[PDB]
Each structure stands twice: as C-alpha cells, then as structure tokens.
Amino acid sequence: AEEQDAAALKQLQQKSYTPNGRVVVEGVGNLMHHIARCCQPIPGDEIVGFITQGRGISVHRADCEQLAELRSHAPERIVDAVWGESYSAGYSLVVRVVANDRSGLLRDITTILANEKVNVLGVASRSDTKQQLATIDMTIEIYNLQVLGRVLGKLNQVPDVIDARR
Amino acid sequence: MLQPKRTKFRKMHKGRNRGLAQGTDVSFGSFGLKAVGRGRLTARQIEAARRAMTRAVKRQGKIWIRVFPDKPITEKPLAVRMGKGKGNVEYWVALIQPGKVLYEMDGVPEELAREAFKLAAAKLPIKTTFVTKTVM
Amino acid sequence: STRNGRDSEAKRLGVKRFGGESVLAGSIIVRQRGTKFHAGANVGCGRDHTLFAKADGKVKFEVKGPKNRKFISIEAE
Amino acid sequence: MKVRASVKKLCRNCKIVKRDGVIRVICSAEPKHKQRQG
RNA sequence: AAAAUGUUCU
RNA sequence: GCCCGGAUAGCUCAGUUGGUAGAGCAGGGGAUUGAAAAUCCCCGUGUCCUUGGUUCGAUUCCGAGUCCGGGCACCA
RNA sequence: CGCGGGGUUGAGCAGCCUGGUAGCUCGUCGGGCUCAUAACCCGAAGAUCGUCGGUUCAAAUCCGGCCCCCGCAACCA
RNA sequence: GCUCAACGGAUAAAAGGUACUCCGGGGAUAACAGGCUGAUACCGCCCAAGAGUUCAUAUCGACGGCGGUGUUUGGCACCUCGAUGUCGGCUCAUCACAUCCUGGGGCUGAAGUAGGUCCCAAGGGUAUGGCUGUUCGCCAUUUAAAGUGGUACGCGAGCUGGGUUUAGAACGUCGUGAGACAGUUCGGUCCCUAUCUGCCGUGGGCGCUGGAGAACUGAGGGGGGCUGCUCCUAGUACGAGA
RNA sequence: CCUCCUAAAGAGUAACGGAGGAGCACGAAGGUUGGCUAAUCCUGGUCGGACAUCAGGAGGUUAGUGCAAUGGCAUAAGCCA
RNA sequence: AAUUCCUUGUCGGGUAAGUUCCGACCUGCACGAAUGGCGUAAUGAUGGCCAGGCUGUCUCCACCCGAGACUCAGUGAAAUU
RNA sequence: AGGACCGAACCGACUAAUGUUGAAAAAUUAGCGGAUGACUUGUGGCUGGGGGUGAAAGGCCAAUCAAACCGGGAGAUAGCUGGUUCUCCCCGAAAGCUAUUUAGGUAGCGCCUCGUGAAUUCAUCUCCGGGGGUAGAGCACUGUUUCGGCAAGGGGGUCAACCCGACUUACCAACCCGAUGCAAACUGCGAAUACCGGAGAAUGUUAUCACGGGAGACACACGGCGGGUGCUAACGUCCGUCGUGAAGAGGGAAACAACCCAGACCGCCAGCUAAGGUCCCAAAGUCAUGGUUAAGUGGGAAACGAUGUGGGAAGGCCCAGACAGCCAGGAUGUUGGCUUAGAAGCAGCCAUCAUUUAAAGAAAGCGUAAUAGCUCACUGGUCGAGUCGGCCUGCGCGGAAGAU
Ligand SMILES: [Mg+2]
Ligand SMILES: [Mg+2]
Ligand SMILES: [Mg+2]
Ligand SMILES: [Mg+2]
Ligand SMILES: [Mg+2]
Ligand SMILES: [Mg+2]
Ligand SMILES: [Mg+2]
Ligand SMILES: [Mg+2]
Ligand SMILES: [Mg+2]
Ligand SMILES: [Mg+2]
Ligand SMILES: [Mg+2]
Ligand SMILES: [Mg+2]
Ligand SMILES: [Mg+2]
Ligand SMILES: [Mg+2]
Ligand SMILES: [Mg+2]
Ligand SMILES: [Mg+2]
Ligand SMILES: [Mg+2]
Ligand SMILES: [Mg+2]
Ligand SMILES: [Mg+2]
Ligand SMILES: [Mg+2]
Ligand SMILES: [Mg+2]
Ligand SMILES: [Mg+2]
Ligand SMILES: [Mg+2]
Ligand SMILES: [Mg+2]
Ligand SMILES: [Mg+2]
Ligand SMILES: [Mg+2]
Ligand SMILES: [Mg+2]
Ligand SMILES: [Mg+2]
Ligand SMILES: [Mg+2]
Ligand SMILES: [Mg+2]
Ligand SMILES: [Mg+2]
Ligand SMILES: [Mg+2]
Ligand SMILES: [Mg+2]
Ligand SMILES: [Mg+2]
Ligand SMILES: [Mg+2]
Ligand SMILES: [Mg+2]
Ligand SMILES: [Mg+2]
Ligand SMILES: [Mg+2]
Ligand SMILES: [Mg+2]
Ligand SMILES: [Mg+2]
Ligand SMILES: [Mg+2]
Ligand SMILES: [Mg+2]
Ligand SMILES: [Mg+2]
Ligand SMILES: [Mg+2]
Ligand SMILES: [Mg+2]
Ligand SMILES: [Mg+2]
Ligand SMILES: [Mg+2]
Ligand SMILES: [Mg+2]
Ligand SMILES: [Mg+2]
Ligand SMILES: [Mg+2]
Ligand SMILES: [Mg+2]
Ligand SMILES: [Mg+2]
Ligand SMILES: [Mg+2]
Ligand SMILES: [Mg+2]
Ligand SMILES: [Mg+2]
Ligand SMILES: [Mg+2]
Ligand SMILES: [Mg+2]
Ligand SMILES: [Mg+2]
Ligand SMILES: [Mg+2]
Ligand SMILES: [Mg+2]
Ligand SMILES: [Mg+2]
Ligand SMILES: [Mg+2]
Ligand SMILES: [Mg+2]
Ligand SMILES: [Mg+2]
Ligand SMILES: [Mg+2]
Ligand SMILES: [Mg+2]
Ligand SMILES: [Mg+2]
Ligand SMILES: [Mg+2]
Ligand SMILES: [Mg+2]
Ligand SMILES: [Mg+2]
Ligand SMILES: [Zn+2]
Ligand SMILES: [Zn+2]
C-alpha cells in the first residue's frame, strides 16, 4: 500500500513538472527543425533531416526505418548533417522500461528515476495482460549520452526491472 | 486469474472426475507437466504454478497452460443452513484426470524446464510428472 | 431465497408402441413435441404431432428420404 | 537443528544420514544446514 | 411597492 | 569520568554503513497600486556543527573538537 | 447479505411509471444595468442518465449482475 | 358471473397479542450440553518468490499446496421435551501437551548479559487487585512464570444467583393496539434425610488349614518433587566500552 | 400452469436444486389454393452514414416461428398473394 | 441519560489501577415539553457511586460455647423403587 | 397544630439467616417501616362471576383466579399420548405416488390379505423386431477454451495536417485457416444396461390380470451403484435403482438393526460347507513350497521428504585401469574487450577464440575495495574391481500432538 502511495506521489510530481545551435543542418545553423519521435537522436551515431513542407526539418537519427522509407520515396528532401554544437539542454529521451509487476515495483522505478538530475517531462504507464508485466515509457530530458547511459544502468540496478531501453 | 469471460450458466453441478484426460500429449511445447494425480486445479493454483514456472525460466522460452478453470465451484457462507438454494461461485476449477498435461514449455534446456515444473508442481494439489514431446 | 422453484408436469412423451408391436387403428404409436417421428404408411400425424395408427397392424420404424428422418409405418398384417 | 518433514542437502558438503531411523542432514561446512526429519 | 454592500494604510 | 543520541534554506522539518538536498510556510521578482491585500503569473532564495580521514565518488561511514539532549556512574 | 428505495447537467429534484419527446429550481458561462460588486434583466451553453452485460428495431426507461449509497430486519430460547 | 393465485377451490364473509397464560403432544423439531462432520477456527508441515547489507531457509515468508486437532464460529438434528438445570464466580479439582516458569539441548543475524527460533521434557509450580455479571479484556502492581486446552464451554442432590430466562415497573424504540426488542433500567422463592457406584475414613465376619501373641519382609499402592534473591567463584571469561 | 436440465438413453422421478416463461394474442396471425426462400458477407451505387432502399456474387437456414424454452418445421409449420 | 447501538464514546474528577459513579462535551442509532420538559429543599426498608467509622466480609482460618449430627434405650415416618 | 419526630402495644413485611418430606400449604429469629391516621381493629351488614371489588398487581373474591366454586349439559371434543387381557396354523406389507387449511391426519391408486373367475396370462433365458440419446466420445452447431498462422478494424508514429490517403510498427486485433481442451441445461456420433413387442425351451403350487371383501401404510433407516445439495463434509440432505434392516434369528466383522456369509416348523451329544478363519485366550495348519518387511509395518492418514530395503528389463563409464580416496598441475595472449566509480575467471554486459598443451572454462563456488588467495571442472600418476544414475514397481521409514 505504502509502495503504491509512493508511486502515486511520484506520478503526481512528474505531472507537476510537465505542467538554436542544437542541430546545424549541413554547415548552416539556425534552420527551423525538430526531433522526430520515431527515434529521437541526442548524441546519436549521426543524424539526418527530412526537409518537410511545413514545420521546417524533422531530424530522424541516421539508419532509421522511417528515414530510409523517405529516402526510397524521394531523396532530395533529405539532408545529412552534424549534431551542431550540442544544445545546452539537448532534450528528448524516451526510455521504455519492461518489468515484472509486484505490489510496489512501479513506485520503486519512479523513485529511482527521481533524485538523479533528470527532467521528467512525461510518464506513460500500463500493465500488460499477456502476463503481469509492468511496462512504462518515461519522456525525460537530459544533457548527454553518458548521463542517459548512467540513468539506464541505475534503472537496471533495481532488480525487478527486466530490461530498460529507448 | 483464469476464468471464463462469459457463461451460459452461473452455477454448475459437482459432477464427477472419473476417467483419464484427452489432453495427454505435449502438443505445443517440448516439455510438459502431466497430472498423474486426479483432482481439481483451482484458477488461483494454476496462476501460482504459472508464476513459479515463468519465474524459474526467467521469461526465456514460451509456456502453455493447457488446463483452463471453466467449472464454477460454489460455496455457502458461514452460519448458513443447508437449504436456501445453491451457494454463490467463490472460485473456478479445472477437473484434472490422470494424463492431463497442465503446462507445456519450450525455448529452454531440459533440466531448467524440469526445475521450473518442480516449482510449478509444488503449487498444485495433484501429483504431477515430467513429460516430453514424443514423435507420434 | 431462491427464484427457481418451478417445473412443469411431465407430459409422458415418447414411444408408446415399438417396432413389431401389433396395434389397432387409433393406437398412439408416439407422443412427441415435433415430428421427431414422421407419419409413414398407415400412420397419422396428430395436431400435436402424436403419431397414431390409421390401420390395424405391426409398427415399423424406418429411416427414409434425403434428410434421413425416422418414419413410423404400420405393416398391415 | 532444523527439524522438517523435508530434509535436503543444502550444499555439496551437506550429507544425508539415517540415525535411529531419522533422516538427518549433517554438514561440516555449515552447521545451520544440519537438519532432522520430525 | 422593492434599491444590500464598498479590502487595508495614506 | 564514561557512554549514547542529535546538530540540514529565513524558520518548521524531509531525506542515513555512500551518488551533488527537498515539502510547507516565509521571501523574492513581475503584472497592479501610492504601497498593499486579494487576483495573476515566475522563481530555491542553503557554511548539511567546523576541521581532518576513507574513496574512482561523502549530508551520511572513522576520527577530532564544538554545541545541545539524554543516560549512566561518582560522597573529601 | 435477507427485504425494499435510489444513483440523472456542478447541486438538488422531477422523468423511469410501463421503451422511443432530458425537464424544473440553484449554479456556471457571455452580455446588460451600476462608479463597482450585489440583487435584478436578457442570451447561452451542460447529460454514454453509477457501471457492466442483456433484451431488443431501440433502453434512462424493462431484466439480470456488479459498484456506491439510504432505509431495514436481523429475532424465540 | 370467482388474481376461489394458498390456483382439488374449507365460509358469501376473518388480523394481531400473550412474559398472565393454559391443555394435548413431540427429542417427529429448536435453544443447553453430548454425537457425526470439520467449511471456519486453531496447530503443524510442503514449495520458496522475495525481505533479511551479502545470503530463500538466524528470523521472516508472498503466490500457492498438503495434513492434524476437535478447539472457536458453524453444518446436520442421532441422543434427551412423562425435565439432561444455562453464563460468570466461588470450593474442590483431574487429565492432555500444542510448555508459560523451572530442567536438558541444537541453530542463531549466539561476544557477554539478554534474546530469537526449533527439538526434547508434563515432576512440581503457574498472581493480588481496580473496573465490569462477566468469561474475556483493559489498567495497576507483582511474579521464576502468571501457560493453552479437555473434563456436560468439569464441578448448583457442593455453595452463590451478579447475568441470561416468568410474573411488577419504567425508558428508548417498533407497533393503531394488546404487546414487542441477542436494547436498556430497577425489582424479583436455587428443593432433596444418599439405596447403588464412586470416593475418604473406619469397623465386623470368614479366610490364610491346629491355635495364639508378637515382630517383620515388601509384591503392590500413595505422598513428595516448585522456585526466588544474595554472596562466593569474579567484576574473572567475554567485551572497544557499557 | 408451460419449457429445459437435474432424470441414471422408454415413462416417471425429489430438493427453499439450477435456468427462463404463462394467466394470453389473432375473424386473421384461422381455412384453403397458387407462389416465393432465409441470417449474414463482399464488391458496387443519389442524399445514405457502421445501420435504411437497389444491383449481382459468396452464404446455405447461421434466420423465421405473434411471445419463454425445448422439440420441431423447405413437402416447409417461415414469408407473400 | 432509568433513553446512547457503535461504546468501556472523548475529555476531566474520584482510585495505585474505575466497563460503575460524579462533571463536562454533543457525533440525541432512537431526548423534549401535562402518555409533560427542566429544576427542586424535605422525604425514601428506592437505584448508583464515593469516604470515615466499624468490623472474621476477606487475607485465613483458630479456638470456644450451646442446638442438631455420632453411640445407647424407647417410639417410628417419607419421596423413591 | 401536624397524613410532624422518636418509640412500645397494634398494623405491617425491606434485608439476612433458618426452615423447604417445615414446628408452619409462606413461619421463625435477628434486625426493619408506620405507629393520631388516606391509621388500625371487633361486631353486624351490603357488593356475585364476564359479575364484584381493586390507591391498579390482572390484585383479591374461602389454601382455587386473564374469569371463583358446586351441580347439570357430559361419556363435550382430542387428527394427540397412553393402554387395549388366552392359544395354534397359513399368507404377509408400507413408510411410495397423487390430493389435501395438508405435511405426525386423511382419501384413491401402488404393495398385503381372503375370496371367485379367466386366457400359454406372467416371470427366467435364448434369436428376432424396435425406439432411444445416458455412459463414453466429439467439437460442425450453441457456448466456452489455450496456442500458432494470415489478417480486415482500431491504435501509434513517419510523410501531410484541408484532405486524399501512402508508408510502417517488439501496440492492440474481430473474421478465416491449422493445432488444443472443456459443458447438467452443446451433439455432424454413441454403447452397456433398462424398457416395449414377438417367437421358442424348460421351469415355477397362477407366480399374471379382472372383479369383490378386509386391511395396513402413506415418519422410514442404513449399504451398494447413478446423481442433485453440501465442502465429491456429516450416521447430513433430496431423488433413481437393487439389497438388507424395518418385519429376519444363526455365524463372521472384538463389542456393532442396515456390512459380509446365511433365510431359524420342531428335535438330535450326527456329517458336509458359507463368510470368516486355523499359536493361546478360542473351534481348526505353530501346514507345505518360494519370495517380501524388520517398521511391531501389520495393527489409522497426505503433500513432500530420504545411499531404508527387495525384484525387473534397459543405458553410460570399466584390467587402453573406471568410481572413491592419495599425490601434483589447473598456464599463455590476458588486466579478452567493454561498461563502470572499479571490475584484473567471478556488480554486470558481450564475444566465449586460439595457443603451449598430458590437460587447464576468457572459468563452477568460495574470496578482495579491485588485485591477490583458496577449492572445482579437466588432466597424468597412485590404486586394483566394478561403479554411476535413471524408471520400473514391491514392502517399509518420517511427515504422525489430547485430553479418566
Ligand atoms: Mg539417541
Ligand atoms: Mg404443557
Ligand atoms: Mg427418536
Ligand atoms: Mg448442540
Ligand atoms: Mg467437544
Ligand atoms: Mg459443535
Ligand atoms: Mg432428533
Ligand atoms: Mg433425517
Ligand atoms: Mg413420550
Ligand atoms: Mg425420567
Ligand atoms: Mg513436546
Ligand atoms: Mg503430574
Ligand atoms: Mg523423580
Ligand atoms: Mg482480573
Ligand atoms: Mg460448565
Ligand atoms: Mg454455577
Ligand atoms: Mg451436580
Ligand atoms: Mg438477578
Ligand atoms: Mg412486565
Ligand atoms: Mg442448594
Ligand atoms: Mg513412588
Ligand atoms: Mg426419462
Ligand atoms: Mg432410465
Ligand atoms: Mg453497402
Ligand atoms: Mg434514545
Ligand atoms: Mg452502553
Ligand atoms: Mg472501592
Ligand atoms: Mg475516566
Ligand atoms: Mg464498586
Ligand atoms: Mg454523566
Ligand atoms: Mg420521554
Ligand atoms: Mg404540547
Ligand atoms: Mg404529549
Ligand atoms: Mg413526571
Ligand atoms: Mg414510605
Ligand atoms: Mg435409636
Ligand atoms: Mg406521624
Ligand atoms: Mg387485615
Ligand atoms: Mg399489604
Ligand atoms: Mg432481596
Ligand atoms: Mg413471631
Ligand atoms: Mg420481625
Ligand atoms: Mg415511629
Ligand atoms: Mg366483618
Ligand atoms: Mg357462571
Ligand atoms: Mg352464576
Ligand atoms: Mg402485567
Ligand atoms: Mg370463559
Ligand atoms: Mg351434549
Ligand atoms: Mg372425557
Ligand atoms: Mg412366509
Ligand atoms: Mg402437496
Ligand atoms: Mg383386495
Ligand atoms: Mg388370490
Ligand atoms: Mg461425459
Ligand atoms: Mg402424510
Ligand atoms: Mg412420507
Ligand atoms: Mg422425509
Ligand atoms: Mg427415502
Ligand atoms: Mg440408496
Ligand atoms: Mg440419514
Ligand atoms: Mg424393503
Ligand atoms: Mg441378523
Ligand atoms: Mg450377528
Ligand atoms: Mg470392528
Ligand atoms: Mg459375537
Ligand atoms: Mg474358506
Ligand atoms: Mg484352540
Ligand atoms: Mg509354519
Ligand atoms: Mg508412514
Ligand atoms: Zn527517426
Ligand atoms: Zn552445508
């Protein structure tokens, strides 16, 4: 019960929280852009931007499926690039965390997510009926790949978590 | 817990549990937990067994639950006399004869599977033996 | 407190005269709800599908037709 | 002394033995592990 | 016939 | 004499054999008034008692001295 | 868990009353009156009718179950 | 022409109370206790997910499983309605062990002291009060400990009769009302001279082979079996100290 | 009072066993003669939509029976005249 | 509360400790104004509680004196079976 | 003065004890209340039974009171309880159904009996004619059920956001296909039995049916098999069918209506057998042959536990030396990398190779802050016979604590 309460509190906190050097596309900075949710690049192994009709460019992360499809369809809108100067904030990590649902696992996970210097923008949550598998996607904001890795490691360390990835 | 989502009838007769099973072979998986002992597996028990075996395997390889608790077992509350109609459905059971494969399992080593089924067996009220996917 | 105390009086359906049973004309061979038995030769199907003898003789059950239905005939002997 | 219905070799150094018709795990390596059937 | 009230300190 | 406990934003308290600290109030700063209350917004705004040690890294663990709160012993 | 009654717009009540028409008062919102808030005036929005099944042509309505409520009787030794 | 629907239709035409009750019955049927049962209860054990820094198993023990006991709440209605007296207290107890203390021991997350848990062990012991009818409980202060059960929830031909459970009266409540309430309140007859068993005592008769008086033996039976504190060992072992 | 099951393959068969219905309706919803064949699904097509009506194919009684259920029903007992 | 189930309500008093008593709260299951309400001196073989005194009520029984009980003599029942 | 005070007589009756077959059908003793009053008491009177009287309790009205007593109606009525008296012989039930202001009563039918009549009537079995839709089975149907397939239809997201609609995606996902179960109220199947009809044989005292007289009974019980209910609890409960008891003794089951065996006309100091037994109590094997247990199992119990012990076919290592002890090694690239704070076989993650090799895992457990260290697998000797571990079943062990 206590665990549940804690989890609830964490969720509430998250909700409350929720409430241009970044990407230099092809040797010309300050281009209207945005990270795509299909797969969200931070310091990723190269990126590629699809020049959209509206809302400028959509950055996809290099070797993406959607990006590949786009290329196949029409290569001329696509532009390869560098990940600029590393934007001060450098937001956008969605972290999918699969875990075995006992009475007080989700709460624990939430707790572990907190304390670490991570801005929790959103928390999607559900228990899968295929077993009793708690699965959760935390939309979080953080400043580096190393930091992300560390966070992942921390998450793993809570033994009830089966696997944690993007 | 395993339970029929919908039914024709809420209350079922006791019946009897004589005979052997039809679900006798390890149809789907590689290994099987075959009920030697006659009885009735409640839904809860089955669930427990599943938990034990899944846990044991560590979600490596697939597991089947051949028996389904489709029969509603009623009870009367305490300080209630014998008349006044048939009692309410407290839980659901699967009548297990000798032969019924209860769980099948693949995607694991044999030893591991056996271990899992030991744990599973502990949970269950009926005597159970390990079996394999026989050719024909 | 139940709400299932009810049941009807049993109507005594079924076969009154069986295979090779000698019947007088008028004798009910079968009582039934449907034409679970159909009227064969020298057998009448009453308004409640009661099969009765239209002649004196031995009762004779027989599956007939494409639908494979039980016809009760009477073999005039 | 544990005294169980079920006595088991809890390690490799645990040794089952019947004394006065009583199954007993006795272990050199760990005296916690020593058991009895009762 | 019916028409209540006016945040504090300047 | 000896021990044990406690010493964290202004101030109430939260977090401990180790991962850069929060909740309330209070405060700020804006809109706005003469300034306020109200209303509307936005915000940690900290010598974790000082000094050393241990460590790949200390609020926390070991000292070392302080301070307070105990609980013990002591009869010139 | 035995007998009835109820769960409807933010609140309270009607409707159910024998399926097919969502109404009344207060509140809310937008105007107006005023110096300004009241009161008053005008206009407006609002409801998967506890939930889940079911019966149906169709359910708020009929029926079942479950969730919460309100009565209630729970005794004689 | 009858929701004569209690539907083989008692009349055209009919509801309650009784603790003021009465008669005839019933253990065909309840309350009491016994019996059978064991859902529940309590006590065990099986699995071991975890917790326990590490480590399932010192201690815990999820999800589940299997038993025992008869021991709570119940089920059944077999015993008793030509009476088997009910709760509690008192007085005497007696057995069981599932031991609370005392004795022995294993493991310990056992340094010592103190504990925890498990095994064995029933010899003896095993609280006075306050409140309440209470058992129980809570509280006070003890105690080595304040065991848990059985015994007609032991024991009313032993006592009590505070409670429940007649007749009076009242309150609250429901009932139009008589009245009614595991609601309350005040008041309210507890009989028996022991035949038999049993038991505690205590004699007579005969026997034990001739008798009598003594003294014995001891088959067997009973009783008894509790424990504190203080001091020494030694402020020694142990412990960084306490 | 009726339907099923309980009911142990004739009938029958209890329980304060488990399920639902009836206390009618219809002068056509009866009689007969002639004819017709369903639910659903796909593709298409005025408003027309997941759902009205019309094309054809698949479908083959899944439907219908004035109402409960069971047994029946294409020779239709179903639906038209 | 002669009323209050939940309930030994909570708080205070009284006690070493108070399900009773007194006082107070008000959340009156379900008080209430002539089937009267709330007060009330006096009264009561009235109910409840406390205190002093007093005590074999008790700790925890002891002895003693008488009437029975026991033995003898006389008379001589009873329920029950 | 006073329904004033205290307190005798007098009236009363609060407490206690006694007594309860009493001294007494309400008293005694000790106390206790009133004791000039609505007091008390004598004598006589009046009030009468649904009537009186009642400072009200249903109190009192002659030891009697929610309707006095006595007599009569009157032998009220009693579906209830009890009881119902000599003998022998034959037959011999029921505790069911249906209805019942009925449920413990009663009525008709079923069964019992006595009587008369009647057919090859009935029963047994054998061959034929049948209908079943239960057991079982099955899953096309009704539902339900797990998995795999391809997948409309939703959801997410990427193109685009007015859309067309395109792409896809470890999201869900109906229909359809393949495999899997389950069902009292499912059946594209389907027994045994039972039931009905026929023919035939022997048997059987007509055993069958009809009518008529007389009933009884309509509380059943346990045992078996099939179920419902309950908890696949009850000597529970309600049904079906047979048995027994009821109404049935004898023998066995220690004792034990209903279990087993077996139907007592009488008698016998004859014999044979049934169940069950055969060392002694206690009638008969201390019988025979081959095995098993060792627990007093037998002579009470489960999950689970365990080199308990027997039997079976089959398998791996085995005098190219096993298994177990005993003696050594158990290395190099190497700190594999990576990921971490560190990780050097051993927080973990990922490759998991080769080399020198007799053999040595990028390491199975312990161990460190990590190294180190200590065992292991694997290896060679040492040693000289089998050993290892399933799975089969037999019997056993623990699990296994209660009260005289
Ligand atoms: Mg020994
Ligand atoms: Mg009487
Ligand atoms: Mg009797
Ligand atoms: Mg009883
Ligand atoms: Mg008992
Ligand atoms: Mg009992
Ligand atoms: Mg009885
Ligand atoms: Mg009975
Ligand atoms: Mg009698
Ligand atoms: Mg008697
Ligand atoms: Mg013991
Ligand atoms: Mg003793
Ligand atoms: Mg001794
Ligand atoms: Mg006490
Ligand atoms: Mg008693
Ligand atoms: Mg008593
Ligand atoms: Mg007695
Ligand atoms: Mg009393
Ligand atoms: Mg009274
Ligand atoms: Mg007495
Ligand atoms: Mg002795
Ligand atoms: Mg039948
Ligand atoms: Mg049958
Ligand atoms: Mg269309
Ligand atoms: Mg009240
Ligand atoms: Mg009270
Ligand atoms: Mg006192
Ligand atoms: Mg108090
Ligand atoms: Mg007192
Ligand atoms: Mg008071
Ligand atoms: Mg009043
Ligand atoms: Mg008034
Ligand atoms: Mg009044
Ligand atoms: Mg008054
Ligand atoms: Mg007076
Ligand atoms: Mg004398
Ligand atoms: Mg006076
Ligand atoms: Mg007088
Ligand atoms: Mg008087
Ligand atoms: Mg008295
Ligand atoms: Mg006198
Ligand atoms: Mg006197
Ligand atoms: Mg006086
Ligand atoms: Mg006179
Ligand atoms: Mg008269
Ligand atoms: Mg008269
Ligand atoms: Mg009265
Ligand atoms: Mg009268
Ligand atoms: Mg007369
Ligand atoms: Mg008479
Ligand atoms: Mg005879
Ligand atoms: Mg009847
Ligand atoms: Mg006759
Ligand atoms: Mg005759
Ligand atoms: Mg079947
Ligand atoms: Mg009767
Ligand atoms: Mg009967
Ligand atoms: Mg009966
Ligand atoms: Mg019967
Ligand atoms: Mg039977
Ligand atoms: Mg019975
Ligand atoms: Mg019979
Ligand atoms: Mg006999
Ligand atoms: Mg006998
Ligand atoms: Mg016996
Ligand atoms: Mg005998
Ligand atoms: Mg024999
Ligand atoms: Mg002999
Ligand atoms: Mg011999
Ligand atoms: Mg055993
Ligand atoms: Zn992308
Ligand atoms: Zn060990």
Side-chain angles (χ1 to χ4, degrees), chain A residues 1 6-8 19-166, chain B, chain C, chain D:
Chain A
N20 211 163
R22 188 205 194 67
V23 181
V24 176
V25 177
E26 176 43 52
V28 34
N30 196 356
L31 281 213
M32 199 213 257
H33 56 232
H34 58 102
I35 282 174
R37 310 145 122 284
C38 50
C39 44
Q40 299 163 268
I42 329 93
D45 187 49
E46 299 199 327
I47 37 68
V48 141
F50 191 77
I51 296 166
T52 60
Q53 214 163 41
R55 327 119 234 169
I57 275 164
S58 138
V59 186
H60 280 297
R61 205 297 205 79
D63 307 77
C64 166
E65 288 78 1
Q66 272 69 10
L67 183 275
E69 278 143 51
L70 286 177
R71 192 81 155 173
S72 189
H73 208 107
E76 207 101 319
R77 319 192 86 77
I78 288 166
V79 177
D80 58 293
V82 308
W83 199 66
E85 70 95 35
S86 78
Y87 192 53
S88 300
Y91 346 98
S92 308
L93 330 150
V94 159
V95 299
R96 184 180 201 72
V97 183
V98 178
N100 198 254
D101 188 46
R102 314 128 143 113
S103 181
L105 160 275
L106 285 167
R107 90 80 151 219
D108 258 290
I109 283 170
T110 57
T111 313
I112 204 157
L113 175 64
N115 313 288
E116 196 111 309
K117 316 116 216 78
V118 310
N119 298 289
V120 177
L121 294 149
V123 168
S125 186
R126 56 271 135 73
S127 184
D128 207 300
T129 44
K130 73 201 174 193
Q131 209 207 314
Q132 291 226 245
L133 282 134
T135 319
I136 35 162
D137 284 56
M138 307 150 161
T139 310
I140 61 169
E141 153 190 314
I142 254 300
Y143 310 101
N144 207 243
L145 186 64
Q146 290 283 310
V147 177
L148 167 62
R150 281 156 156 77
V151 164
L152 281 157
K154 199 150 131 79
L155 273 166
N156 286 10
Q157 274 177 238
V158 158
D160 287 2
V161 169
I162 301 162
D163 54 285
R165 299 194 194 77
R166 87 309 198 73
Chain B
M1 287 157 54
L2 298 179
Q3 179 175 301
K5 293 164 79 279
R6 190 183 142 287
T7 49
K8 289 152 153 271
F9 300 106
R10 287 153 57 259
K11 306 181 205 292
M12 186 160 284
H13 287 344
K14 194 108 58 34
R16 298 296 130 102
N17 196 16
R18 31 200 315 283
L20 308 315
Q22 308 307 319
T24 311
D25 298 306
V26 183
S27 304
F28 308 104
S30 301
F31 314 110
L33 186 56
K34 172 171 283 193
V36 171
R38 185 184 306 287
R40 42 171 69 163
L41 297 173
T42 70
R44 287 183 176 285
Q45 284 162 14
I46 285 158
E47 267 291 346
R50 191 197 51 71
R51 273 165 194 176
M53 62 172 54
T54 302
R55 177 122 289 176
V57 298
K58 304 285 169 195
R59 300 176 58 264
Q60 293 165 26
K62 190 169 168 63
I63 290 169
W64 290 257
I65 307 156
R66 296 287 304 287
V67 302
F68 190 87
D70 55 51
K71 171 161 161 46
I73 296 299
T74 66
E75 304 188 331
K76 280 184 149 52
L78 278 57
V80 182
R81 289 189 175 158
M82 298 308 310
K84 314 298 171 279
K86 192 174 171 62
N88 296 289
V89 179
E90 300 302 329
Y91 59 97
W92 295 79
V93 310
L95 299 179
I96 309 313
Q97 300 89 76
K100 246 299 193 298
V101 174
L102 311 177
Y103 306 90
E104 298 187 28
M105 185 178 280
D106 80 334
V108 284
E110 185 168 23
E111 216 295 311
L112 176 52
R114 268 207 181 86
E115 187 264 303
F117 286 173
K118 201 73 63 260
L119 304 205
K123 301 328 180 182
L124 305 165
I126 40 174
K127 193 169 267 70
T128 55
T129 192
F130 192 83
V131 284
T132 58
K133 176 170 57 54
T134 57
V135 176
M136 210 175 75
Chain C
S1 58
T2 58
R3 59 197 301 170
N4 297 322
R6 300 158 316 288
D7 191 19
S8 55
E9 295 167 293
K11 304 300 191 68
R12 285 66 168 234
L13 307 184
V15 177
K16 309 296 174 183
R17 306 289 185 176
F18 296 85
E21 187 153 351
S22 57
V23 298
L24 301 168
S27 289
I28 292 172
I29 304 160
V30 176
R31 307 217 85 159
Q32 47 181 5
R33 286 287 84 98
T35 47
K36 185 168 153 192
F37 295 96
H38 293 256
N42 294 5
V43 165
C45 190
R47 63 150 286 181
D48 65 347
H49 318 283
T50 290
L51 299 204
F52 59 93
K54 294 177 81 190
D56 289 34
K58 294 198 295 184
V59 169
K60 171 59 160 60
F61 289 76
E62 44 178 20
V63 179
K64 291 203 160 286
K67 292 189 167 66
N68 291 298
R69 344 191 91 176
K70 291 97 177 200
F71 284 75
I72 301 183
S73 53
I74 276 167
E75 295 179 319
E77 219 75 51
Chain D
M1 185 71 79
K2 311 182 211 312
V3 35
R4 324 266 219 73
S6 155
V7 304
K8 290 174 170 173
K9 292 169 75 199
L10 310 183
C11 66
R12 59 143 283 102
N13 300 299
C14 290
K15 190 186 177 76
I16 300 286
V17 55
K18 198 163 190 162
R19 300 178 172 171
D20 204 59
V22 185
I23 310 310
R24 294 164 186 284
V25 174
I26 98 285
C27 180
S28 56
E30 183 56 45
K32 279 185 162 216
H33 289 206
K34 91 194 225 206
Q35 288 148 99
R36 158 158 142 277
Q37 273 204 42

